[PDB]
């Protein structure tokens, strides 16, 4: 129900119980954090066999259709240096 | 009342009317955007008299006591390059 508002106690249980109808499946319910927006990041890394390595620069794969990569950018635009670190 | 929740119509008017009590002043009320957090920024600039100039780097003055400057940092840490531009 896109219930991003905390202090919700009379609608979440009603929503779950109406979900259980016609979609009983297993009565077990799992709770997680809900994120409104999503942008994919993927840093690169490298390691020898003598205990020494160094991470490469980040990357972005926001654009993808049907789980197929389309176009990507190695420098994640709008990414603070400190974060990169 | 720190009313950051939109779709508020039965509490904002009650809050304003209870504010008017013992603090009538003028009945005119002004509405603005409310920001939860504040951090001060101040960019520098330079201009000749022959129509040509160039902005210097940003700055930060977050730390101040009783409107008195205490400690400041020219490179605003955690500031994306694009924003600087």
PDB file of C-alpha atoms in Angstrom, chain A residues 6-85:
ATOM      1  CA  UNK A   6       5.411   5.484  10.543  1.00  0.00           C
ATOM      2  CA  UNK A   7       3.056   5.429  13.544  1.00  0.00           C
ATOM      3  CA  UNK A   8       0.745   3.294  11.392  1.00  0.00           C
ATOM      4  CA  UNK A   9      -1.062   0.608  13.391  1.00  0.00           C
ATOM      5  CA  UNK A  10      -4.714   0.416  12.238  1.00  0.00           C
ATOM      6  CA  UNK A  11      -4.050   0.227   8.478  1.00  0.00           C
ATOM      7  CA  UNK A  12      -0.994  -2.042   8.212  1.00  0.00           C
ATOM      8  CA  UNK A  13      -2.752  -4.981   9.879  1.00  0.00           C
ATOM      9  CA  UNK A  14      -5.899  -4.405   7.805  1.00  0.00           C
ATOM     10  CA  UNK A  15      -3.767  -4.240   4.651  1.00  0.00           C
ATOM     11  CA  UNK A  16      -1.965  -7.477   5.552  1.00  0.00           C
ATOM     12  CA  UNK A  17      -5.234  -9.270   6.336  1.00  0.00           C
ATOM     13  CA  UNK A  18      -6.794  -8.135   3.061  1.00  0.00           C
ATOM     14  CA  UNK A  19      -3.621  -9.321   1.317  1.00  0.00           C
ATOM     15  CA  UNK A  20      -4.013 -12.750   2.934  1.00  0.00           C
ATOM     16  CA  UNK A  21      -7.413 -13.058   1.245  1.00  0.00           C
ATOM     17  CA  UNK A  22      -7.223 -14.874  -2.122  1.00  0.00           C
ATOM     18  CA  UNK A  23      -3.431 -14.782  -1.704  1.00  0.00           C
ATOM     19  CA  UNK A  24      -3.080 -16.902   1.435  1.00  0.00           C
ATOM     20  CA  UNK A  25       0.122 -18.708   0.331  1.00  0.00           C
ATOM     21  CA  UNK A  26       1.924 -19.072   3.692  1.00  0.00           C
ATOM     22  CA  UNK A  27       0.694 -16.933   6.576  1.00  0.00           C
ATOM     23  CA  UNK A  28       4.285 -15.933   7.402  1.00  0.00           C
ATOM     24  CA  UNK A  29       4.950 -12.247   6.675  1.00  0.00           C
ATOM     25  CA  UNK A  30       8.358 -10.590   6.302  1.00  0.00           C
ATOM     26  CA  UNK A  31       9.117  -6.931   7.061  1.00  0.00           C
ATOM     27  CA  UNK A  32      11.932  -4.904   5.502  1.00  0.00           C
ATOM     28  CA  UNK A  33      12.966  -1.348   4.757  1.00  0.00           C
ATOM     29  CA  UNK A  34      11.181   0.219   1.788  1.00  0.00           C
ATOM     30  CA  UNK A  35      13.116   2.486  -0.585  1.00  0.00           C
ATOM     31  CA  UNK A  36      11.260   4.931  -2.816  1.00  0.00           C
ATOM     32  CA  UNK A  37      14.083   5.260  -5.365  1.00  0.00           C
ATOM     33  CA  UNK A  38      16.763   2.889  -6.629  1.00  0.00           C
ATOM     34  CA  UNK A  39      19.948   3.494  -8.600  1.00  0.00           C
ATOM     35  CA  UNK A  40      22.484   0.716  -9.060  1.00  0.00           C
ATOM     36  CA  UNK A  41      26.137   1.071  -8.077  1.00  0.00           C
ATOM     37  CA  UNK A  42      29.016  -1.380  -8.588  1.00  0.00           C
ATOM     38  CA  UNK A  43      32.626  -0.767  -7.512  1.00  0.00           C
ATOM     39  CA  UNK A  44      35.525  -2.780  -8.999  1.00  0.00           C
ATOM     40  CA  UNK A  45      38.260  -4.581  -7.040  1.00  0.00           C
ATOM     41  CA  UNK A  46      41.551  -6.390  -7.609  1.00  0.00           C
ATOM     42  CA  UNK A  47      43.675  -8.742  -5.492  1.00  0.00           C
ATOM     43  CA  UNK A  48      46.935 -10.634  -5.796  1.00  0.00           C
ATOM     44  CA  UNK A  49      47.756 -13.815  -3.926  1.00  0.00           C
ATOM     45  CA  UNK A  50      50.276 -12.110  -1.680  1.00  0.00           C
ATOM     46  CA  UNK A  51      47.737 -10.108   0.314  1.00  0.00           C
ATOM     47  CA  UNK A  52      47.576  -6.804  -1.530  1.00  0.00           C
ATOM     48  CA  UNK A  53      44.847  -5.138  -3.569  1.00  0.00           C
ATOM     49  CA  UNK A  54      43.221  -1.917  -4.727  1.00  0.00           C
ATOM     50  CA  UNK A  55      39.649  -0.970  -5.551  1.00  0.00           C
ATOM     51  CA  UNK A  56      38.970   0.544  -8.958  1.00  0.00           C
ATOM     52  CA  UNK A  57      36.501   3.332  -9.644  1.00  0.00           C
ATOM     53  CA  UNK A  58      32.745   2.982  -9.163  1.00  0.00           C
ATOM     54  CA  UNK A  59      30.182   2.444 -11.913  1.00  0.00           C
ATOM     55  CA  UNK A  60      26.499   2.982 -12.694  1.00  0.00           C
ATOM     56  CA  UNK A  61      23.992   0.561 -14.268  1.00  0.00           C
ATOM     57  CA  UNK A  62      20.761   2.495 -13.788  1.00  0.00           C
ATOM     58  CA  UNK A  63      19.621   1.915 -17.379  1.00  0.00           C
ATOM     59  CA  UNK A  64      18.464  -1.653 -18.008  1.00  0.00           C
ATOM     60  CA  UNK A  65      15.420  -3.144 -19.741  1.00  0.00           C
ATOM     61  CA  UNK A  66      14.071  -6.556 -18.705  1.00  0.00           C
ATOM     62  CA  UNK A  67      17.237  -7.188 -16.669  1.00  0.00           C
ATOM     63  CA  UNK A  68      19.388  -6.524 -19.766  1.00  0.00           C
ATOM     64  CA  UNK A  69      22.165  -3.938 -19.669  1.00  0.00           C
ATOM     65  CA  UNK A  70      21.669  -1.123 -22.175  1.00  0.00           C
ATOM     66  CA  UNK A  71      23.891   1.876 -21.418  1.00  0.00           C
ATOM     67  CA  UNK A  72      26.218   2.576 -18.491  1.00  0.00           C
ATOM     68  CA  UNK A  73      28.654   5.186 -17.186  1.00  0.00           C
ATOM     69  CA  UNK A  74      31.872   4.464 -15.297  1.00  0.00           C
ATOM     70  CA  UNK A  75      31.943   7.862 -13.467  1.00  0.00           C
ATOM     71  CA  UNK A  76      28.729   7.960 -11.539  1.00  0.00           C
ATOM     72  CA  UNK A  77      27.685  11.465 -12.213  1.00  0.00           C
ATOM     73  CA  UNK A  78      26.647  13.321  -9.058  1.00  0.00           C
ATOM     74  CA  UNK A  79      28.796  11.250  -6.695  1.00  0.00           C
ATOM     75  CA  UNK A  80      30.801  12.953  -3.949  1.00  0.00           C
ATOM     76  CA  UNK A  81      34.480  12.098  -3.718  1.00  0.00           C
ATOM     77  CA  UNK A  82      34.252  11.197  -0.054  1.00  0.00           C
ATOM     78  CA  UNK A  83      31.595   8.625  -0.818  1.00  0.00           C
ATOM     79  CA  UNK A  84      33.726   7.111  -3.521  1.00  0.00           C
ATOM     80  CA  UNK A  85      36.385   6.553  -0.918  1.00  0.00           C
TER      81      UNK A  85
END
